[PDB]
Amino acid sequence: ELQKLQWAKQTTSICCYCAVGCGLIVHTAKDGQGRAVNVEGDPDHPINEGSLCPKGASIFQLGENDQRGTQPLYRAPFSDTWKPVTWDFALTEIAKRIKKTRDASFTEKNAAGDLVNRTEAIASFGSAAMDNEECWAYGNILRSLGLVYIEHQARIXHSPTVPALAESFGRGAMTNHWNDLANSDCILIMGSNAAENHPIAFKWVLRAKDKGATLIHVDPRFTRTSARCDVYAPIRSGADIPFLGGLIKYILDNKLYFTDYVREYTNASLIVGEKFSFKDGLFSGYDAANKKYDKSMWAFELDANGVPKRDPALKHPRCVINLLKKHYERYNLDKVAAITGTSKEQLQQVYKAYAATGKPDKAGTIMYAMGWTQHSVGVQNIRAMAMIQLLLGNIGVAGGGVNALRGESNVQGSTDQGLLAHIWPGYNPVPNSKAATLELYNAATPQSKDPMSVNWWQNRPKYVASYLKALYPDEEPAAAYDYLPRIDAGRKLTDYFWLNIFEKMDKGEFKGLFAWGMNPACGGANANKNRKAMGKLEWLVNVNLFENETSSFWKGPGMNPAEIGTEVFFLPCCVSIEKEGSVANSGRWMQWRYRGPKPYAETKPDGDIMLDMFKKVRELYAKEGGAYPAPIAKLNIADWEEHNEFSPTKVAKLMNGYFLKDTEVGGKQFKKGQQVPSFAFLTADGSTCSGNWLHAGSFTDAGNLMARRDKTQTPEQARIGLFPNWSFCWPVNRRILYNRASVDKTGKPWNPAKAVIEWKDGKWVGDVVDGGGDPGTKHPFIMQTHGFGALYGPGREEGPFPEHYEPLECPVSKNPFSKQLHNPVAKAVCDPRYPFIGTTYRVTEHWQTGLMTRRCAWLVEAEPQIFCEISKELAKLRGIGNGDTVKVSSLRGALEAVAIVTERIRPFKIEGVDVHMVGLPWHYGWMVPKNGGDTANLLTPSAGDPNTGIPETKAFMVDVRKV
Amino acid sequence: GKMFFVDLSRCTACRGCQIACKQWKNLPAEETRNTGSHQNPPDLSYVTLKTVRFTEKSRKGPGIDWLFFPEQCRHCVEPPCKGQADVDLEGAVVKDETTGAVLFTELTAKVDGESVRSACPYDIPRIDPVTKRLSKCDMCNDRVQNGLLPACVKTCPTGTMNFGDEQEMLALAEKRLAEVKKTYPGAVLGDPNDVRVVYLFTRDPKDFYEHAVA
Ligand SMILES: Nc1nc2c(c(=O)[nH]1)N[C@H]1C(S)=C(S)[C@@H](COP(=O)(O)OP(=O)(O)OC[C@H]3O[C@@H](n4cnc5c(=O)[nH]c(N)nc54)[C@H](O)[C@@H]3O)O[C@H]1N2
Ligand SMILES: Nc1nc2c(c(=O)[nH]1)N[C@H]1C(S)=C(S)[C@@H](COP(=O)(O)OP(=O)(O)OC[C@H]3O[C@@H](n4cnc5c(=O)[nH]c(N)nc54)[C@H](O)[C@@H]3O)O[C@H]1N2
Ligand code: SF4
Ligand code: SF4
Ligand code: SF4
Ligand code: SF4
Numbered sequence A: 001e002l003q004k005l006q007w008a009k010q011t012t013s014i015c016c017y018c019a020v021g022c023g024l025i026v027h028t029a030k031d032g033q034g035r036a037v038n039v040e041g042d043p044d045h046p047i048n049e050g051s052l053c054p055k056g057a058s059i060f061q062l063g064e065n066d067q068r069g070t071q072p073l074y075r076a077p078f079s080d081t082w083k084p085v086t087w088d089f090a091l092t093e094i095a096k097r098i099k100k101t102r103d104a105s106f107t108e109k110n111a112a113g114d115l116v117n118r119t120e121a122i123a124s125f126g127s128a129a130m131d132n133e134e135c136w137a138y139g140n141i142l143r144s145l146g147l148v149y150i151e152h153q154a155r156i157x158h159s160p161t162v163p164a165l166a167e168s169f170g171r172g173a174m175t176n177h178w179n180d181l182a183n184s185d186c187i188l189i190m191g192s193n194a195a196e197n198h199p200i201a202f203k204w205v206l207r208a209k210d211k212g213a214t215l216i217h218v219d220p221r222f223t224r225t226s227a228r229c230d231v232y233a234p235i236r237s238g239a240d241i242p243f244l245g246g247l248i249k250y251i252l253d254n255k256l257y258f259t260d261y262v263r264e265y266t267n268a269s270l271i272v273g274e275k276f277s278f279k280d281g282l283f284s285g286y287d288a289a290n291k292k293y294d295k296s297m298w299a300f301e302l303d304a305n306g307v308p309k310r311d312p313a314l315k316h317p318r319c320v321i322n323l324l325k326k327h328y329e330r331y332n333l334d335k336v337a338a339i340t341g342t343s344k345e346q347l348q349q350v351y352k353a354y355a356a357t358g359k360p361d362k363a364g365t366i367m368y369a370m371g372w373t374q375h376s377v378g379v380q381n382i383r384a385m386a387m388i389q390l391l392l393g394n395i396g397v398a399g400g401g402v403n404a405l406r407g408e409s410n411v412q413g414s415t416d417q418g419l420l421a422h423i424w425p426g427y428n429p430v431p432n433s434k435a436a437t438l439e440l441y442n443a444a445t446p447q448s449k450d451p452m453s454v455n456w457w458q459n460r461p462k463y464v465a466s467y468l469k470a471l472y473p474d475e476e477p478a479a480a481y482d483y484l485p486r487i488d489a490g491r492k493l494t495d496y497f498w499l500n501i502f503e504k505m506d507k508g509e510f511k512g513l514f515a516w517g518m519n520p521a522c523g524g525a526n527a528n529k530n531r532k533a534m535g536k537l538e539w540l541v542n543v544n545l546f547e548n549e550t551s552s553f554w555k556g557p558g559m560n561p562a563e564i565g566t567e568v569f570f571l572p573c574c575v576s577i578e579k580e581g582s583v584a585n586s587g588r589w590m591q592w593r594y595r596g597p598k599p600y601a602e603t604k605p606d607g608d609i610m611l612d613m614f615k616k617v618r619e620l621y622a623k624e625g626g627a628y629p630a631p632i633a634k635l636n637i638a639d640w641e642e643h644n645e646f647s648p649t650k651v652a653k654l655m656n657g658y659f660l661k662d663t664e665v666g667g668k669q670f671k672k673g674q675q676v677p678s679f680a681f682l683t684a685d686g687s688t689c690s691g692n693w694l695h696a697g698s699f700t701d702a703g704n705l706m707a708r709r710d711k712t713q714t715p716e717q718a719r720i721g722l723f724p725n726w727s728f729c730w731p732v733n734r735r736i737l738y739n740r741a742s743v744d745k746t747g748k749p750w751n752p753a754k755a756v757i758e759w760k761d762g763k764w765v766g767d768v769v770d771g772g773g774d775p776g777t778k779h780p781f782i783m784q785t786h787g788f789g790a791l792y793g794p795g796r797e798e799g800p801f802p803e804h805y806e807p808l809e810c811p812v813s814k815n816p817f818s819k820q821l822h823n824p825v826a827k828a829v830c831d832p833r834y835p836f837i838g839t840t841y842r843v844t845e846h847w848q849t850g851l852m853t854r855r856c857a858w859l860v861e862a863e864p865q866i867f868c869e870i871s872k873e874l875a876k877l878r879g880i881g882n883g884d885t886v887k888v889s890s891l892r893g894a895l896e897a898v899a900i901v902t903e904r905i906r907p908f909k910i911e912g913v914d915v916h917m918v919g920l921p922w923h924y925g926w927m928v929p930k931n932g933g934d935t936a937n938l939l940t941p942s943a944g945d946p947n948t949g950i951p952e953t954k955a956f957m958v959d960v961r962k963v
Numbered sequence B: 001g002k003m004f005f006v007d008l009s010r011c012t013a014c015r016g017c018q019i020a021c022k023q024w025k026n027l028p029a030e031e032t033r034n035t036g037s038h039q040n041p042p043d044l045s046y047v048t049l050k051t052v053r054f055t056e057k058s059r060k061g062p063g064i065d066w067l068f069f070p071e072q073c074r075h076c077v078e079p080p081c082k083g084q085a086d087v088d089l090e091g092a093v094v095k096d097e098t099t100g101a102v103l104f105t106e107l108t109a110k111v112d113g114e115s116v117r118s119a120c121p122y123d124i125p126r127i128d129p130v131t132k133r134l135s136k137c138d139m140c141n142d143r144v145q146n147g148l149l150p151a152c153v154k155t156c157p158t159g160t161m162n163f164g165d166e167q168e169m170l171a172l173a174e175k176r177l178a179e180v181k182k183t184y185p186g187a188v189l190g191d192p193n194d195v196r197v198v199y200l201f202t203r204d205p206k207d208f209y210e211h212a213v214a
């Protein structure tokens, strides 16, 4: 035996860092009673097979860390010191703060006299770090208290994705999963550094290569990913659409598209109305006054029944395919080669290698994460990837897909639970002031008159009603709909998002902020503005693992505690391996993890913190009364707790949903109290509850499917690695989305050797079919109104076809593709004292702002200090030596960093001028370690895009000087 | 006995192996500074049994050849470090009959530190300045004797790290050398008749590290 593990209890967990969702084994002392003694990889886990990157590998040192918070802490106004306090004190005083601010600032009706029932005096940040049951409970706590400013991580990195892919495929999610990468014949990594940022992914990527796949990295920098790809193609910042447009042209010119796939399963055959045109970088319906398009001009021509017209011959010149052909003829190799900085020869190499996956029995996959999709045409960057994938028949198939890599462990889950301002859980929009009734809300859902179009979103009313019944089961949904806050229809949607929360905070327009499992003092662009602006808060709640730059902004660099009047509550939360619950990985795998050791010192799961806090508010409102108490008093929290404790288990069962009385649905009978077996069996009439319709199927009468650890596979499942008995993915355990597109109209795979589904006997064998019905009797994209994979996407603000608009303001003065330089539906200074393009990115060893990993000695050991990566060309110019201290400065702030001179950075050629790019990690902050450095967000602008409301962190103007 | 096959053509320099070695033995972290490199700690020491060395080599066309070298004791079939210390004390350095692990014991405090280091062709052994004990990769002999993989091998995501019986490992190495040659035509095995840690180099081993091979 191994003495270290001999007397320890062994439990399973899921990594608390990136969205790969690697399995852990935890060993806990005194047969589970004491502290963890060991944390390493779970060798039975089908994704990581026991392997861990240094972040997963160091989770022991994250957990058993003497620097972790021990108890609630309290900072009095204008005080320069923390005072330890009890949980009883912290939560009551916070519960009073919530009620005071709310009672004062609550609004039943807006200026227009529309019912809204909200407070705009409190904002919340976070979080994708919390468990799914914690995220859902949190969303519903904040909404009962009437908040509309509810944001988290997802806004910055995964918001320009949901629309791009929803427009294209019907859903905003990663199409395949990690294990499926191994089935690809060509892997294109573009806007991703996955070897460093999703490291276990590279297990399956290199297994693709073992079976003959080509690995292509397309990055402005040569990274650890590049080191291990067959082809590295440098691209200059924001040249991605030229690159992707040139590929679309290459595919059509050389007829490398999957012809049958395109004709049947895309909208190639749909006829676009005569009012669609594109001339000189603008589409038709453009309004120069309002910098906005009238999208009604982009409508399909409809037949008598309202169904878009189709020419299956693809001959009509107003066919999507023919308009697509015409639109991308401008993107020839010479123009694309010139603007991207990628050689003509290297474009041909990458286009040939990837467009070859147009073969029915070859599959190509695209991997992108955050890259530079931050700007206003990030959504159009992604739309182009979708379109290339629909052209080559790569959507629905093994080794295909748009693999939009999620960032955090549970950012997929936290978005799914509606911790963004615009969505309730299950992506039901937050009703606006003009959705006066539940009936009006439900009338906003488009219908289709195509009998071959499933159009699943017509079921919305059953999901909204079942949702309202999980929060307010004693009320009719129709009545409960009035309890929850509404946003102004008259107001712009971005005004409720991340960056405008920082604008409003700097204008003193917020009393309280929740910084719940985030570090905005380092995470937000323009850190100096934000740190000052937090000084204009009345109260601040920070729930975190450690004291940090947010909890202690008031004693930050150049700050006088005495003058800063912000009251701060620091609540220390327990680590991932010290609580039970689920995280949803990038592949939608909702995986159950267990408690190893008991919480460290007096730390609590976020569940108990938020529940106890709300219970205090609630009993306060039973004592004092105050502003519209019905939403707080009526909230069903009894379904959340067991034995005076937040119950991950029960909350999960509620989110899945159960019948509130005896019901007949889909020709089957169900008893009161019985768990809902699928979202197919939810109702709009109040028979069913369900906190999240996507979770309906996850925790049934059969048990907790998220907790399954069964590697049983049929031959056909094992060949592509579906592992359908390993945990559970939404929707209804469909591992690969749009899989109906992977077979012909007889139900035979395009690629039988890597079949996703197959029609054998009178059934679909393999993955769960993404849409019921016999082969050739349904359109494959069931969440689409019209049912087709969209090449032409007329719901996008920027136009129905991706077009190149320069995201770089400063160093570019002319567009080679039109008269239109910048995004025509969108004032940077470009002070010549800042002649270089600063960018921020990650290293393998650190996590986010480094709040966590800067407390882990083994990660500091490998990456102890903020560095500045520059080319040999720029080191010659500013006289920088490898290792020399340098000063990186911008209009927003300045910092010191260690110079790394490397050939991995190169000058870009932009309009016959050498433009130097300098790189920084944003993993550093003033609190830890000693000599570590502060956040690169000292340098970044908080000027965002009116489209996305996301700030610039990948191309911002800096100067770099030797010290 | 047992053997490591390290296919350096699959390494992403994630440094899982580096962290994992220290988590398993609960080794302390060194004081480090960035001196214009990702490589840290800069060298092996008494508390660091494995560090990943980073080398940037120029090449025609975009990018570079980025060479990664996770360094450890080679657990030599005929250990020169033993042969040296056996003149001072037959016990300080011993060889496990079952695994072929070369193990430094507590009796290394009763030998010449530098003498045992200099005798090692790979410059592996390190000295605690306080206590004068020799430390290095011990092959996770503990774990192997209990049927577990070494921490650095289990944690590696790329298939770079491989462990098992010397018959299977020399079989894997020779078959993998053939397949990797198709991409990197100058790919070689490091001293594959003298060591139990057989690195596959994508080119001249000396580009990865001066002491990569004997
Ligand atoms: N080690 C580590 N891994 C992480 C994280 C972490 O903090 N540390 N965070 C996680 C989170 S929350 C997220 S959202 C993801 C983000 O994952 P990534 O998007 O992979 O992360 P970055 O390194 O910020 O950016 C990826 C790459 O985009 C490149 N890039 C920059 N500008 C452009 C451009 O104009 N075009 C193209 N094609 N590429 C460009 C950069 O050079 C960089 O190599 O990573 C996750 N994984
Ligand atoms: N310049 C620049 N800025 C960026 C980015 C960039 O690339 N460049 N990336 C952006 C992106 S993609 C993201 S995701 C954001 C991330 O920004 P933040 O979310 O603010 O990042 P951190 O706070 O560093 O990391 C997440 C937090 O999770 C907390 N945590 C961990 N486990 C738990 C738990 O169980 N409960 C609770 N309550 N908290 C827990 C940790 O304490 C840590 O503070 O940063 C954005 N900012
Ligand atoms: S950070 Fe991501 S890749 Fe690394 S161990 Fe955790 S889940 Fe796996
Ligand atoms: S864990 Fe494997 S891939 Fe990562 S640095 Fe070590 S040997 Fe290379
Ligand atoms: S590599 Fe050096 S220290 Fe290790 S067994 Fe060989 S001679 Fe001894
Ligand atoms: S075999 Fe064990 S001691 Fe040697 S480097 Fe690997 S983890 Fe460290």
Ligand SMILES: [S]
Binding pocket: A128, A153, A154, A157, A406, A407, A408, A411
């Ligand atoms: S994220």
Ligand SMILES: [W+6]
Binding pocket: A153, A154, A156, A157, A407, A408
């Ligand atoms: W992110």
